[PDB]
Amino acid sequence: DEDLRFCYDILQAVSRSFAVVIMELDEEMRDAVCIFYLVLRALDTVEDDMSIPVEFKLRELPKFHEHLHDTTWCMSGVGVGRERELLERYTHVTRAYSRLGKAYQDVISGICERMANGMCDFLTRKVETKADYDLYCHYVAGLVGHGLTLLYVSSGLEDVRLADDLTNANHMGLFLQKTNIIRDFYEDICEVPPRVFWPREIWEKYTDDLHAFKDELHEAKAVECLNAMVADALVHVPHVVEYLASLRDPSVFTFSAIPQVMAMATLSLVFNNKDVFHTKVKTTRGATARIFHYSTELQATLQMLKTYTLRLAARMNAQDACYDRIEHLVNDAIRAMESHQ
Amino acid sequence: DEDLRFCYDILQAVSRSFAVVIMELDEEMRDAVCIFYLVLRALDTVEDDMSIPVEFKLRELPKFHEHLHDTTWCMSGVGVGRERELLERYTHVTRAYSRLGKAYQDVISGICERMANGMCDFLTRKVETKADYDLYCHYVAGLVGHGLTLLYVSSGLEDVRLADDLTNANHMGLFLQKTNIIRDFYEDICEVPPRVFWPREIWEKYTDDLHAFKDELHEAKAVECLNAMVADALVHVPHVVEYLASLRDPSVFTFSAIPQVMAMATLSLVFNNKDVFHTKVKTTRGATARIFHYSTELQATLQMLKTYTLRLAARMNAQDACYDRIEHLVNDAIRAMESHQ
Amino acid sequence: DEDLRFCYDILQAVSRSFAVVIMELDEEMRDAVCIFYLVLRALDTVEDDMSIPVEFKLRELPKFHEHLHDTTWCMSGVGVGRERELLERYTHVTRAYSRLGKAYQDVISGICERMANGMCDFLTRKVETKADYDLYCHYVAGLVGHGLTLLYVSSGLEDVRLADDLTNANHMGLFLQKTNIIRDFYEDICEVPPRVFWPREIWEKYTDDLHAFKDELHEAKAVECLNAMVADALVHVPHVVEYLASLRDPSVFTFSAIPQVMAMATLSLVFNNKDVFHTKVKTTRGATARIFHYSTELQATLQMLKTYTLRLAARMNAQDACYDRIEHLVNDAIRAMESHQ
Amino acid sequence: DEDLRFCYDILQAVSRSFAVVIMELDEEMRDAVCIFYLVLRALDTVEDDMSIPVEFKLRELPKFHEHLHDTTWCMSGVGVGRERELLERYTHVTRAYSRLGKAYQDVISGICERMANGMCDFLTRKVETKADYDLYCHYVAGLVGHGLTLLYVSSGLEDVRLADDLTNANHMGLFLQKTNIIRDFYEDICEVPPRVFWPREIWEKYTDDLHAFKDELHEAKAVECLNAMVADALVHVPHVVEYLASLRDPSVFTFSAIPQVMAMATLSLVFNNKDVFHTKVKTTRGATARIFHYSTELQATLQMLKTYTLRLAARMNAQDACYDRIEHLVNDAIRAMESHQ
Numbered sequence A, B, C, D: 001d002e003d004l005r006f007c008y009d010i011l012q013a014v015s016r017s018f019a020v021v022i023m024e025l026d027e028e029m030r031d032a033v034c035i036f037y038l039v040l041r042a043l044d045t046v047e048d049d050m051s052i053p054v055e056f057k058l059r060e061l062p063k064f065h066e067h068l069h070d071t072t073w074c075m076s077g078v079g080v081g082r083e084r085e086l087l088e089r090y091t092h093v094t095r096a097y098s099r100l101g102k103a104y105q106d107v108i109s110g111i112c113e114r115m116a117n118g119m120c121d122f123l124t125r126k127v128e129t130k131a132d133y134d135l136y137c138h139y140v141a142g143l144v145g146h147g148l149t150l151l152y153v154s155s156g157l158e159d160v161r162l163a164d165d166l167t168n169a170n171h172m173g174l175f176l177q178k179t180n181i182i183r184d185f186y187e188d189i190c191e192v193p194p195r196v197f198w199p200r201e202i203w204e205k206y207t208d209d210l211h212a213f214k215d216e217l218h219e220a221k222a223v224e225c226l227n228a229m230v231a232d233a234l235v236h237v238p239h240v241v242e243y244l245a246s247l248r249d250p251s252v253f254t255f256s257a258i259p260q261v262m263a264m265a266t267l268s269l270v271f272n273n274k275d276v277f278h279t280k281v282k283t284t285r286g287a288t289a290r291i292f293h294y295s296t297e298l299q300a301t302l303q304m305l306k307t308y309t310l311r312l313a314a315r316m317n318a319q320d321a322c323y324d325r326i327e328h329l330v331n332d333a334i335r336a337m338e339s340h341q
């Protein structure tokens, strides 16, 4: 009882974004997700701490899920902020964990290990090909989609048919992750050491050095590359609509819908906007408020995604090289929407 | 002599279009240009012949230019009509070739090779992206722009400054080649096997299978795609003007300008035209007759381009898709033309 | 018996490098390769003589091969010492040449003429763009690759399959030529007039004057450029591996492999080395002695290239400016190798 | 036909041993066996790969046989070189499969799944007892014996009674596998991590640390263990004879007899041979050619197996600590051979 109280607080203190969205879910269901996020957010803390030697991570991370069956475990001064607190007093998480139906214990435990090894694979190398790019997103987000999806089926709140093919689920995750990777470009490169996720298979066509876009002189090629990334992201939209339209439970829907609409809105702002190369673009608090409101039932949300896909395509001219590819990606997306409208 | 006289006889037989504009040329330039054409024409035959195995082409095409240095070489059973004769009696071409100035020879030999190798590149891969489309047009037409431009400087008829930047020279070719690719859609997609040049990046918004455009049922989409192709072509117009505006010699100008005015005329007739998918759209012999008549100096050729670009723009409503796309490209062309009137 | 015997005598004294490797081929094929070299070396003698006006070379070279069928042709007052003897008594060369199979002759003559006009092209212009750098290397090296390959097929020692795509054969030559061009920087620049083969497109990013690299003051940037040159060279390794992997005959293999491993070993020494800007970096005699011994079969030569490539990568830190560009180029190389291990 | 081509090409690059023996087979049957191998070879890749997490294999391998009907499935980061190229381009394999006979398909899918699950079992534990040894060989070899046998009956080539008892079919597979495990002892133990297959129940009687065999100090006790392994494989011989005798179709027999005579030949060499603890014992490439030539019909192959089984015993004395055990296991095989003469 006392433990769950720590989780929801440490949560609300770790991700103000997620914390609000999760409130759309039902209590029992919500709890599982809450712990699930914390389990991953804990793993993400060890991976991110750059003051920790690599071989260490490659050694611990893999078997981080094993500490889920040990209510005595915890980690010392690893990470900073509230994150460092989650590890030092991780005990509370493992507690609430053992009080979850064995059904949820498996999903969380499995997804954890899988994501654990995934991160380790990329601690050795960087993102080169489109394949790499997609694999990374799968490891840090795709699997989350897989996880959440399984929990929906495990709770009976969602038809068992939903777990049959977890492809669209992966798309749900990849979309959000890619949207961020694109949006947080500048920040990623301003850190020391500089983090780069944009696959060379793409940015190389527009430059020899990715730090060149940091300059206002290479803007032309920069923005162009930006649209190249945006396009790559739109490929998932059609599948996002499919996954959303296949949800029956209104509680689960809103929880899965909002994050997607937020991304589309953000993706429409970053698309063909040089501002992405020096500042962090964000959607007005009013827009995100509107999004939260109407994203309660399939129809309203679909017409919202409709607007943002048209708002995105409206931000381009007839003299942009990506003109044709973008329009096609937009049409397909809309197609999928009308398909369910 | 007897060889050179054959070149002209075969030229007038194979090409009833080019052979007419080449007479605007002069006697060494015309001979060189005549030989240069026959060389590329012989190359195109072997490459476009589908009965010929691919591996062969990839082994013989890259060295096709070497034959220019061997007056005994020829080809027996290849191509239809006069084309077969051109290869069977290629001796004459090489015979005459050897009597040209090393300057002219180097241009022809060099360009022939570069083109041959470029062709070999697209023999084992489809034209997927817009970039692919531009590269192809560069290999088979853009390079002809370079060649001729180099022949001008070589002959001393044009200022050496011209060959400094061959970018616009490439635009001259791409404009012609694309216009033909757009105009000869039906003829190409009907051959066996069907020849496609329209880049997927563009036609995939309107259709899954390109053959669908032959069916009147998909006329609506066919026309939209068609207009997307035209917009893609209008991009080169401004540069076409710049190149023609940079020519000083009368002969060279007319020879370079006529084909361009012819293209802009054909383009203004195929644009938003639904007949391009079931017949070959041509200009009246009167329209072209006039073109050959007035395209002898900048000023006249300019107000003709202006006229045709206007006719082209006056063939669309505010209601339909590419309105904005086109009107923008039309203004750029005109604006570029006025900048010289 | 006197003519062919003269060929080797001159060969051994003009090329102390090639003259060694060539002894790996069987007599018949070896004699052909011997003439092929002497012809190219003679062609190289004219182009290299700087005490001879340009318009002279531009007239003679293009029609050099024609002298192959003339048992009395020769040239005097060209080349230093021995090289001069070659041209002075070029009679023997053509005599022994007039006894080589019609197959070989057509190859030597073919490549000769192609290379000749290629040199003439770069006698009036400089190596400005990367395309120029690649084309130049193709004219002086790439062609040697094509040529040698054709001789292998002609001799019947290699399957005719080998000459179906000389793209990698070109990569072979470029890798050697590029390596030497990089290693022999100081040597070439100190000559009067200063010889520069490093493309502006690459070094213009690090300096205004290329002579600045001779001064210890600009040492830093000089090294960065050196690494970019090496990076530009590593692009061919994966292809070099493919070519050697497609060889079946022992003699042909060693003869083709040895020079390659030598280049790689040399490249691993010059990479990120400042000494390159003031002396000739050589590999130990024992190092080459080893290469000659083990480079007799694929697998053996592969692990060497493997060791040398890793040593090259081990000669740097993540701090280095090109680290990433190289890191991925290194993996790309090792991958092709493992692909055959 | 475009996919089946990819198969044979990849097979020759992977199995240079099997690749030849499979050509013996007849057209129709030939294709089936080709796929069947590439299916098990693809599966074998995921297993052999050590860098892959253990939980990945257990979640994937068991469901591998299902990807056969999914004509667009493939894998990327798996296996080194050519084997990696198979999983990545596994498309052709799944297509060439979808075209095979319904009967042929069911069998390949069956053996695959079964074998896959057996591998997952031995992926989480070592080989301790002889039973473990035999069961392991059953999964990676004995099952193939069943597979092929079920393919001979399916094709109709062989009697339908040939599939009632697959015991001998298992012995066929084990004999080959055990002959390799014993022969490749060194090559396996010299990898990181060290691969050990010899059952503890057999080597413990001669050593405490199996690695000791790599040192000449324990050579004497290494040879005894080796001879214990041979006596362990001779058991299957009498059974291998019955199976080969049950065959009737020429093509099927040759394809089944060659590998067996090869194993026995290899066994006669590695028996009581101490060179097994530092190198790879191969059969003279001349002897293997003989085996290939004469193993086309039962009679010839019986006298060869005869010779090799006598060559095995013609290497020991009555003093050896195994004499008795071997001597009789030989006569047990020798008689079983003459029982068909």
Ligand SMILES: CCCCCCCCCC[n+]1ccn(CC(O)(P(=O)([O-])O)P(=O)(O)O)c1
Pocket (backbone or CB within 6 Å): B014, B015, B016, B017, B018, B019, B141, B144, B145, B146, B148, B149, B169, B172, B173, B176, B177, B180, B256
């Ligand atoms: C700076 C000048 C740019 C040079 C670009 C010229 C190359 C354009 C391709 C020439 N072309 C393509 C098709 N045609 C028409 C013909 O194929 P052609 O035999 O060339 O007259 P046909 O008369 O319809 O048989 C002409």
